[PDB]
Prior knowledge:
The complex is a heterotrimer, with two copies of chain A and one copy of chain C.
Chain A: E1 7-10
Chain C: E1 5-10, E2 15-20, H1 26-37, E3 45-50, E4 56-58, E5 76-82, H2 89-92, H3 96-111, H4 119-134, H5 155-160, H6 165-178, H7 184-195, E6 203-209, E7 215-221, E8 224-229, E9 238-241, E10 245-250, E11 254-259, E12 267-270, H8 274-293, H9 305-308
Parallel strand pairs in C: 1-5
Antiparallel strand pairs in C: 1-2, 3-4, 3-5, 6-7, 7-8, 8-9, 10-11, 11-12
Helix pairs in contact in C: 3-7, 4-6, 4-7
Amino acid sequence: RLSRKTHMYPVRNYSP
Amino acid sequence: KTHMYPVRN
Amino acid sequence: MPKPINVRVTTMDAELEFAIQPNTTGKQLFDQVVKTVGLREVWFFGLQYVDSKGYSTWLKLNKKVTQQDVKKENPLQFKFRAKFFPEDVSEELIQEITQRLFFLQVKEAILNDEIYCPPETAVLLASYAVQAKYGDYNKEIHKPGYLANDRLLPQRVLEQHKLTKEQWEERIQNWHEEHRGMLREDSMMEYLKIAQDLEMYGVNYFEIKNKKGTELWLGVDALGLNIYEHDDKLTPKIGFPWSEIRNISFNDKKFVIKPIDKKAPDFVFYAPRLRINKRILALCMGNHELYMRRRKPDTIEVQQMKAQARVDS
Lengths: 16, 9, 313
């Protein structure tokens, strides 16, 4: 977009 | 549509 | 029936041209290509393209080809290339095609000075290249100079050692003769096994700065992340195995890697642009995905690709 946000990827899942 | 032109064996 | 949109996809040794319909996803385009070349180990590849701004991008399968800033011209240019590399060549590349495609892509990188290479190793690698291209050396077929039109050495060695073409031919040839009797497919794998052990092999580098403003290198690769000093892009200063990584994230430019053990500190750094921070995360997700995948039981599809390959040899 015209702004900034947070992107995050869990290299360790939440034990689904 | 589909595949119409390839060049390599 | 709308107006067809022509596209030119090209592999390391083939050129494909075909029209697609306006609502074709990258996924569908990818498949037609893959089926045309008879590739199955699709998980490594991807379609490469340039957007209007000229930024080299990876085509997204889940999105329409039409609506991704794919630079506009006719036909639309794409490069079918490997986005991810295997942890071990002899154990993940089964089909001879997935082999010559990697063989070609890696040799281009060695040749283009993208993957550092010592002079001994280069010569050695060249020998395996020629054996694959010319077959068994024969004093009748390959007379003095048979290796003049060929690009065999990485410029960085030609610069570092000013031997003549003939001088070089002599060293390479000597080795070409050592492979008397070797098979084409065996010479390319022989090449890859040697390459895969180089330090810069299968590593994606990115210029970053840490909390202070010290220039650095981030190396996203098959086994995790790595932080390199600027002068040394070979040996990392801080490694990050997928195993000890809780999660990775970023904001505008600030990128952060959180350790799985709360005892270790969080490594922070900054990337030039957003577009480049997006690509880094993308690579991680893909490499980490394959990292896991190859630790899972062989899927009931990969399962017998390996057996028919025990018949073809």
